[PDB]
Amino acid sequence: ILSRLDPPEAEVQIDRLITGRLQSLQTYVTQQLIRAAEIRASANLAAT
Amino acid sequence: GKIQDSLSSTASALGKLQDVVNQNAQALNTLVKQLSSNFGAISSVLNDILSRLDPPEAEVQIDRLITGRLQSLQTYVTQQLIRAAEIRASANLAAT
Amino acid sequence: KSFTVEKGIYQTSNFRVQPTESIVRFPNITNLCPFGEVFNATRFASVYAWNRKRISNCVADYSVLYNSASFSTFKCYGVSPTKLNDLCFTNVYADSFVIRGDEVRQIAPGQTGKIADYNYKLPDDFTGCVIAWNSNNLDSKVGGNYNYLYRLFRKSNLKPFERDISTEIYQAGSTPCNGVEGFNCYFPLQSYGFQPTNGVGYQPYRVVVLSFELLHAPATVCGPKKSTNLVKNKCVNFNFNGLTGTGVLTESNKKFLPFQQFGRDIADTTDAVRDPQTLEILDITPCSFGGVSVITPGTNTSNQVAVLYQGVNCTEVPNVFQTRAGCLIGAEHVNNSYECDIPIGAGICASYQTSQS
Amino acid sequence: MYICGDSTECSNLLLQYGSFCTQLNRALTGIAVEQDKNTQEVFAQVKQIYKTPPIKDFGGFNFSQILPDPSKPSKRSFIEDLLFNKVTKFNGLTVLPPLLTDEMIAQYTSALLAGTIT
Amino acid sequence: MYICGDSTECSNLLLQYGSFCTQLNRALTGIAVEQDKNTQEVFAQVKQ
Amino acid sequence: CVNLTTRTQLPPAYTNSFTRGVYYPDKVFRSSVLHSTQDLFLPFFSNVTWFHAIHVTKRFDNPVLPFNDGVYFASTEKSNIIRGWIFGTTLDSKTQSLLIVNNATNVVIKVCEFQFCNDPFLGVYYHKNNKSWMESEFRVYSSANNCTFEYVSQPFLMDLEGKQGNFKNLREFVFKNIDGYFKIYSKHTPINLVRDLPQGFSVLEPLVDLPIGINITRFQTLLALHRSYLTPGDSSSGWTAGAAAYYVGYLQPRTFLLKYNENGTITDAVDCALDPLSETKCTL
Ligand SMILES: *[C@@H]1O[C@H](CO)[C@@H](O[C@@H]2O[C@H](CO)[C@@H](O)[C@H](O)[C@H]2NC(C)=O)[C@H](O)[C@H]1NC(C)=O
Ligand SMILES: *[C@@H]1O[C@H](CO)[C@@H](O)[C@H](O)[C@H]1NC(C)=O
Ligand SMILES: *[C@@H]1O[C@H](CO)[C@@H](O)[C@H](O)[C@H]1NC(C)=O
Ligand SMILES: *[C@@H]1O[C@H](CO)[C@@H](O)[C@H](O)[C@H]1NC(C)=O
Ligand SMILES: *[C@@H]1O[C@H](CO)[C@@H](O)[C@H](O)[C@H]1NC(C)=O
Ligand SMILES: *[C@@H]1O[C@H](CO)[C@@H](O)[C@H](O)[C@H]1NC(C)=O
Ligand SMILES: *[C@@H]1O[C@H](CO)[C@@H](O)[C@H](O)[C@H]1NC(C)=O
């Protein structure tokens, strides 16, 4: 995308990719926490 | 007697409680720092954007800031719930 | 979303103290900026070596520019044209040059064209207003005019906010001219064709670019708006040198170095400011952020409820009780301790006891 | 307040989103209520606040440090004091006070301890 | 690295967004530390 | 233009200047908060090229020095021998250029198309009839054509002694050129008896801000020639200057974590970029 577009036009285009990708990371990071918390409760049972 | 000495000498025994204090403090701090970010807008401060922009044009900039701030809050609330749930489990273990 | 309410405390309608008055403070400078002189000039520098003037330390009113409306084009970017006076900016710059009407579109942010990409290129983040208006009578004579020139060729694109005053004959690759200027070798300069007979469409336009940056340092390009006497210890709206914030204003303890003009807290938010006219230093705080919680026994039980504000200091609000959790109204407290029917926080519980309150 | 700030103009734009604001507030309120609930369960297991006897006949066990001190404020035990010492509305965000004060929590803890020995 | 990729231009836009980039990494690291703790609790039950 | 004779050619002496010339990055005041600002700074423990303006034998050198963003000048003087500075691109009197005098009145400045000679200086003579140091040849420049900016700074005073001694004072400056603004920062340090830059932390305080468009590739320094009766008595050989020393260090973009004291003086600062350890502190 960068090679094809100059900086004034590229910002709006690049921005969309950034926004989307940010969502993917947050969703992944949020999912990990939920799984991690489940494992932590789960791990404690195993420890107990 | 030893336990009194141990408590006064090292902070290792009270470490876990503090993690809770620090973790909560850090979460609150991040949200506040979030406001400064432009989020693609012309300027971070809300008033400044409104003062120098006419209503239709003011709208796009206002929107970006609203969207970015909503995301910040969502992360905090979502982050807070997971921590709350984690703390809740400890309390259930702890009361018992 | 119910017509009946269970016993307990509910939080609704968060309240913030309103600003009683608005105070605007500006630097006390009365010397009108000479925008007019720049606008009217016998000679305007050509695109190759554009004329730039830095205007500062004075008061300019943009109503005449906006108000006069004698100019063909008044494009404004990042600043509302109507809202120009209220905003205060520092480091204002002025550009002077004349180009033909067809190329007026080219001199704008993120646009292409020969002169824009070869003589003068506006930055992408530009926040200024561009003005254009024909002066055909001035650009028409008996012998014509050809002291206005624009570059045709250049090896690389001209940088934003930079000008080329250099004079050297054009070259491409090999067969270097060394002054020869035949075929593949050209002189840098190129004149215009402004003539009275010549059509309006390609007729000369006089273009001025007004560019300014804001919120960096104390600046004195402030509008004509009048200042007011400072107000202290009372929640009121305030503006200082184009900076707007609302909070309680009090004499500030913290020392200030001569260079410094602003103060900030841990969260990088405005904490202190200096009235320019006064020279004093003051602390800004938000008046109050209020969570209003209504305590009621029930709709079945009673129609009387007690309202509590958590933030409240019992004076901020515009019967009364003081509790560690919050300022409390509508409840008469009792000295003895009873089991907590409702939990108000900070070791306080409110219950309905009976004659009835 | 956080999302749109003081300005009414900005707040109207936020209204279009609708249920976001309300949802966020409710979740946080629920979390606060849940937090208050934890303290009650963990500490309030006794209906009656038992008070330790004046007599020090504990069969040679010295409980002076764990038990409350009348000279010190808040009736917190010496061991408790050390723990307290070691641990250490800004912009539309308010930290509500706990339902039970630190002093009140100490009494419940003191009561349980008092109950256990006697 | 994930969101912006190798390109420098992409990185600048990410800076504008805030500490989201930084915050997400911190959350994952917290999760990573927790895994070690769980295993430690479950299996390090013996001194020798 | 008039010249000078019998100069000694030697390789440039080097020293290490560490944690010096940290300048309040901007205008904000903050108390008890650690802040990271990505503003050009002399790198800590950065290499510094020392210079000599001392006769000692027949030694006198004040040649042009390359200039980048980091134009940190740290002269050390006693009887006030180093006075001014020159900025510019080619010093051709055709490109707009900067120039100063350090008089007892002000650090007088100018933005003018000046035609400098090959060997500019400030001249002072010891007269037998009256014990005072007067200017003898102020032919620093030829004339000025176009001057878009003229300027005089705040009043201050200078001692102007004609004696010999160790450098009782210290002066640091950081010249910068950013976003169409020329800027300067200063501090007087009463350091005692150290040949090298003093161990410790001191923070430069901005003195002046000038909005200028001039582009300057390199800069030069001004010396005070200590003309006396013992000298031959001409502009080419008649001079006996005395001790002078000055050090120039460049500035590159770096991130500094700057500690802020309760009052706001920047008591201490740690460079994140410089060390592996140092980088941890920024993240931390
Ligand atoms: C500043 O001074 C220079 C001379 O140093 C001026 O350049 C001359 O200007 C005239 C009129 O345009 C030309 O005929 C000459 O050829 C120029 N000199 C040379 C050597 O070519 C310049 O015009 C002045 N600029 C300002 C803005 O006043
Ligand atoms: C203008 O401001 C200066 C500096 O703050 C002050 O000395 C002066 O009296 C002011 N003048 C008036 C007339 O308000
Ligand atoms: C506000 O502050 C404190 C809070 O207890 C107390 O002095 C009183 O409630 C109020 N006092 C004022 C505003 O002087
Ligand atoms: C209990 O310990 C305290 C502190 O060491 C001591 O003063 C006291 O004498 C001990 N026991 C009794 C019965 O007083
Ligand atoms: C300073 O410059 C010298 C060259 O004279 C070089 O050998 C040395 O590595 C440099 N010092 C540092 C600390 O980089
Ligand atoms: C600055 O001066 C140099 C020559 O020293 C020249 O090559 C360069 O283009 C100048 N640039 C600007 C951008 O003023
Ligand atoms: C600067 O700080 C010092 C030391 O913290 C303190 O006395 C005061 O806040 C300031 N004082 C003076 C007196 O220079």
Coordinates of C-alpha atoms in Angstrom, one line a residue, chain C residues 18-317:
Chain C
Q18 CA -21.6 25.0 36.7
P19 CA -19.3 27.9 35.8
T20 CA -20.8 31.1 37.2
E21 CA -18.9 33.5 35.0
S22 CA -16.5 33.6 32.0
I23 CA -13.2 35.5 32.2
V24 CA -10.9 36.1 29.3
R25 CA -7.3 37.2 29.7
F26 CA -5.1 38.3 26.9
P27 CA -1.7 40.0 26.6
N28 CA -2.1 43.8 26.8
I29 CA -0.8 44.7 23.3
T30 CA -2.7 47.3 21.3
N31 CA -0.4 47.7 18.2
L32 CA -2.4 46.4 15.2
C33 CA -0.5 43.9 13.2
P34 CA 0.1 45.2 9.7
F35 CA -1.8 42.6 7.8
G36 CA -3.1 45.3 5.5
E37 CA 0.3 46.5 4.4
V38 CA 1.3 42.9 3.4
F39 CA -2.0 42.5 1.5
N40 CA -1.5 45.7 -0.5
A41 CA 2.0 45.9 -2.0
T42 CA 3.3 47.3 -5.3
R43 CA 5.4 44.1 -5.9
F44 CA 4.7 40.5 -5.2
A45 CA 7.6 38.1 -5.3
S46 CA 7.3 35.4 -8.0
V47 CA 7.0 31.7 -7.3
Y48 CA 10.7 31.0 -7.7
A49 CA 11.7 33.3 -4.9
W50 CA 8.5 33.9 -2.9
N51 CA 8.3 36.6 -0.3
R52 CA 7.7 35.6 3.3
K53 CA 7.0 37.9 6.2
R54 CA 6.8 37.0 9.9
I55 CA 4.1 38.8 11.8
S56 CA 4.1 38.6 15.6
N57 CA 3.7 40.8 18.7
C58 CA 0.6 42.5 17.6
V59 CA -3.1 42.4 17.2
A60 CA -4.7 41.5 14.0
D61 CA -8.4 41.4 13.2
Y62 CA -9.3 38.9 10.6
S63 CA -12.9 40.2 10.2
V64 CA -11.8 42.7 7.6
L65 CA -10.2 39.9 5.6
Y66 CA -13.2 37.6 6.1
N67 CA -15.5 40.6 6.2
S68 CA -14.1 42.4 3.1
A69 CA -15.0 39.4 0.8
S70 CA -13.3 41.2 -2.2
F71 CA -11.1 38.2 -2.8
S72 CA -12.0 35.4 -5.2
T73 CA -10.8 32.5 -3.1
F74 CA -10.6 32.2 0.7
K75 CA -9.9 28.6 1.4
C76 CA -9.2 27.8 5.1
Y77 CA -7.7 24.6 6.5
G78 CA -7.9 23.4 10.1
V79 CA -9.3 26.8 11.2
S80 CA -12.9 28.0 11.0
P81 CA -12.9 31.3 9.0
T82 CA -15.7 32.6 11.2
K83 CA -14.0 31.4 14.3
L84 CA -10.6 32.9 13.6
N85 CA -10.8 35.8 16.1
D86 CA -11.5 33.6 19.1
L87 CA -8.5 31.4 18.5
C88 CA -5.1 32.9 19.3
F89 CA -2.0 31.8 17.4
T90 CA 1.7 32.3 17.5
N91 CA 4.4 32.3 14.8
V92 CA 2.1 33.6 12.0
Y93 CA 3.7 33.8 8.5
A94 CA 2.8 35.4 5.2
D95 CA 3.6 34.4 1.7
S96 CA 3.5 36.6 -1.4
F97 CA 3.4 35.6 -5.1
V98 CA 1.2 35.7 -8.2
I99 CA 0.2 32.8 -10.4
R100 CA -2.4 32.3 -13.0
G101 CA -6.0 31.4 -12.1
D102 CA -5.8 27.9 -13.5
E103 CA -3.0 27.0 -11.1
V104 CA -4.7 28.4 -8.0
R105 CA -6.0 24.9 -7.1
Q106 CA -2.5 23.6 -7.3
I107 CA -1.3 25.7 -4.3
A108 CA -3.1 23.7 -1.6
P109 CA -2.2 20.8 0.7
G110 CA -1.7 17.4 -1.0
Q111 CA -2.1 18.6 -4.5
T112 CA 0.1 18.2 -7.6
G113 CA 1.2 20.5 -10.5
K114 CA 4.3 22.0 -11.9
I115 CA 4.7 25.0 -9.7
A116 CA 3.4 23.3 -6.5
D117 CA 5.9 20.4 -7.0
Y118 CA 8.7 22.5 -8.4
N119 CA 8.4 26.0 -6.8
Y120 CA 6.4 26.0 -3.6
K121 CA 4.9 23.0 -1.8
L122 CA 2.5 23.3 1.1
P123 CA 3.0 20.8 4.0
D124 CA 0.4 18.1 4.6
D125 CA -0.2 19.3 8.2
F126 CA -0.6 23.0 7.2
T127 CA -3.1 24.9 9.3
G128 CA -3.5 28.1 7.6
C129 CA -5.8 30.0 5.3
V130 CA -5.0 30.8 1.6
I131 CA -6.3 34.0 0.0
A132 CA -6.6 34.7 -3.7
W133 CA -8.0 37.7 -5.7
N134 CA -7.4 39.0 -9.2
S135 CA -5.6 42.3 -9.9
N136 CA -6.1 42.5 -13.6
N137 CA -5.7 46.3 -13.8
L138 CA -2.4 46.2 -12.0
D139 CA -1.2 43.3 -14.2
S140 CA -2.1 45.1 -17.4
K141 CA 0.0 47.7 -19.1
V142 CA 0.8 49.2 -22.5
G143 CA 4.2 47.4 -22.7
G144 CA 3.0 44.3 -20.8
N145 CA 4.7 42.7 -17.8
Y146 CA 7.2 39.9 -17.6
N147 CA 9.1 40.3 -14.3
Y148 CA 6.9 37.5 -12.9
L149 CA 8.6 34.1 -13.4
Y150 CA 7.9 30.4 -12.6
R151 CA 10.3 27.5 -12.9
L152 CA 9.7 24.9 -15.6
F153 CA 12.4 22.3 -14.8
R154 CA 14.2 21.1 -11.7
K155 CA 16.1 17.8 -11.0
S156 CA 14.3 17.0 -7.8
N157 CA 11.1 18.1 -6.1
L158 CA 11.2 21.3 -4.0
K159 CA 10.7 20.7 -0.2
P160 CA 7.7 22.0 1.7
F161 CA 8.1 25.5 3.2
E162 CA 11.4 26.1 1.3
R163 CA 12.1 28.4 -1.6
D164 CA 14.5 28.4 -4.5
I165 CA 16.1 31.7 -5.3
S166 CA 19.0 30.0 -7.1
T167 CA 19.6 30.8 -10.8
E168 CA 21.2 28.0 -12.9
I169 CA 20.4 26.8 -16.5
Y170 CA 18.4 23.5 -16.7
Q171 CA 20.1 20.2 -17.5
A172 CA 19.1 16.6 -18.0
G173 CA 21.7 13.7 -17.8
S174 CA 24.6 14.2 -20.2
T175 CA 25.3 16.8 -23.0
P176 CA 25.8 19.4 -20.2
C177 CA 25.1 22.9 -21.1
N178 CA 27.7 25.0 -19.1
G179 CA 25.8 28.1 -20.2
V180 CA 25.0 26.6 -23.7
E181 CA 21.1 26.5 -23.3
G182 CA 20.2 25.0 -26.7
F183 CA 18.2 21.8 -27.0
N184 CA 18.0 19.7 -23.8
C185 CA 19.6 22.6 -22.0
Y186 CA 17.4 25.3 -20.6
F187 CA 17.5 28.5 -18.6
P188 CA 15.9 28.2 -15.1
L189 CA 13.6 31.1 -15.5
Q190 CA 10.3 31.3 -17.3
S191 CA 8.2 34.4 -17.6
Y192 CA 4.4 34.9 -17.7
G193 CA 1.9 36.2 -20.3
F194 CA -0.2 38.6 -18.3
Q195 CA -2.0 40.9 -20.7
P196 CA -5.2 43.0 -20.7
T197 CA -6.3 41.4 -23.9
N198 CA -5.6 37.9 -22.4
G199 CA -8.6 36.1 -21.1
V200 CA -9.8 36.1 -17.5
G201 CA -9.4 32.4 -17.1
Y202 CA -5.7 32.5 -17.4
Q203 CA -5.5 36.1 -16.1
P204 CA -3.2 36.8 -13.1
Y205 CA -4.4 36.0 -9.6
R206 CA -2.8 37.5 -6.5
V207 CA -2.4 34.8 -3.9
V208 CA -1.4 35.2 -0.2
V209 CA -1.0 32.2 2.1
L210 CA -1.5 32.8 5.7
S211 CA 0.0 30.2 7.9
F212 CA 0.1 29.9 11.7
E213 CA 1.0 27.3 14.4
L214 CA -0.7 27.3 17.8
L215 CA -0.2 26.2 21.5
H216 CA 3.6 26.1 21.8
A217 CA 4.7 29.1 23.7
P218 CA 3.4 32.5 24.9
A219 CA 2.5 34.1 21.6
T220 CA 1.1 37.5 20.7
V221 CA -0.9 37.1 17.5
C222 CA -4.1 37.3 19.6
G223 CA -7.4 38.7 18.4
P224 CA -9.1 42.0 19.2
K225 CA -11.3 40.5 22.0
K226 CA -11.2 42.5 25.2
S227 CA -9.8 41.2 28.5
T228 CA -11.6 41.1 31.9
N229 CA -10.7 41.4 35.6
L230 CA -9.4 38.1 37.1
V231 CA -11.8 36.1 39.3
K232 CA -10.6 33.9 42.1
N233 CA -11.9 31.0 44.3
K234 CA -15.0 30.6 42.3
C235 CA -15.8 28.0 39.6
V236 CA -15.8 30.0 36.4
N237 CA -15.0 29.6 32.7
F238 CA -11.6 31.1 31.6
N239 CA -9.5 31.8 28.6
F240 CA -5.8 32.8 28.7
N241 CA -4.0 33.8 25.5
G242 CA -6.1 31.5 23.4
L243 CA -6.0 28.6 25.9
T244 CA -9.3 27.5 27.3
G245 CA -9.9 25.6 30.5
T246 CA -12.5 25.8 33.3
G247 CA -11.7 25.3 37.0
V248 CA -11.2 27.0 40.4
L249 CA -8.5 29.6 40.3
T250 CA -6.4 30.2 43.3
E251 CA -3.0 31.8 44.2
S252 CA -0.4 29.2 43.4
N253 CA 2.5 28.4 45.9
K254 CA 4.8 26.7 43.3
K255 CA 7.7 28.8 42.0
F256 CA 8.1 29.6 38.3
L257 CA 11.2 30.3 36.3
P258 CA 11.1 33.2 33.9
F259 CA 11.1 31.1 30.8
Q260 CA 8.3 28.8 32.0
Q261 CA 4.6 29.7 31.1
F262 CA 2.7 26.5 32.0
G263 CA 2.5 23.9 34.7
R264 CA 1.5 20.3 34.6
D265 CA 0.6 17.3 36.8
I266 CA 1.4 13.6 36.5
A267 CA -1.3 13.1 33.9
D268 CA 0.1 15.9 31.7
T269 CA -3.0 18.0 32.1
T270 CA -3.0 21.8 32.8
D271 CA -2.3 22.5 36.5
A272 CA -1.1 26.1 36.6
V273 CA -1.2 29.2 34.4
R274 CA 0.1 32.7 34.5
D275 CA -2.1 35.7 33.7
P276 CA -0.1 37.6 31.2
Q277 CA -1.1 41.1 32.3
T278 CA -0.8 40.3 36.0
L279 CA 2.4 38.2 36.2
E280 CA 0.9 36.0 38.9
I281 CA 0.8 32.2 39.0
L282 CA -2.4 30.3 39.8
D283 CA -3.7 26.7 40.2
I284 CA -6.6 25.3 38.2
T285 CA -8.8 22.5 39.6
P286 CA -12.1 21.1 38.4
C287 CA -14.9 22.5 40.5
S288 CA -16.4 19.0 41.4
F289 CA -17.3 15.7 39.7
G290 CA -20.5 14.4 41.2
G291 CA -22.1 11.1 41.6
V292 CA -25.6 11.6 42.8
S293 CA -27.1 8.7 44.7
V294 CA -30.7 8.5 45.8
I295 CA -31.5 6.6 48.9
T296 CA -35.1 5.5 49.2
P297 CA -36.9 2.9 51.5
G298 CA -39.3 2.0 48.7
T299 CA -42.3 3.1 46.7
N300 CA -44.6 0.7 48.4
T301 CA -43.2 1.9 51.8
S302 CA -42.7 5.7 51.3
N303 CA -42.5 8.6 48.8
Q304 CA -39.6 10.4 50.6
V305 CA -36.0 9.9 49.6
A306 CA -32.6 11.1 50.7
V307 CA -30.1 12.4 48.1
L308 CA -26.3 12.1 48.6
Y309 CA -23.5 13.6 46.6
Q310 CA -20.2 11.7 47.0
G311 CA -17.8 14.4 45.8
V312 CA -19.7 17.1 47.6
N313 CA -18.1 19.2 50.3
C314 CA -21.5 20.5 51.6
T315 CA -20.8 24.0 50.3
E316 CA -20.3 23.0 46.6
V317 CA -23.9 22.0 46.2

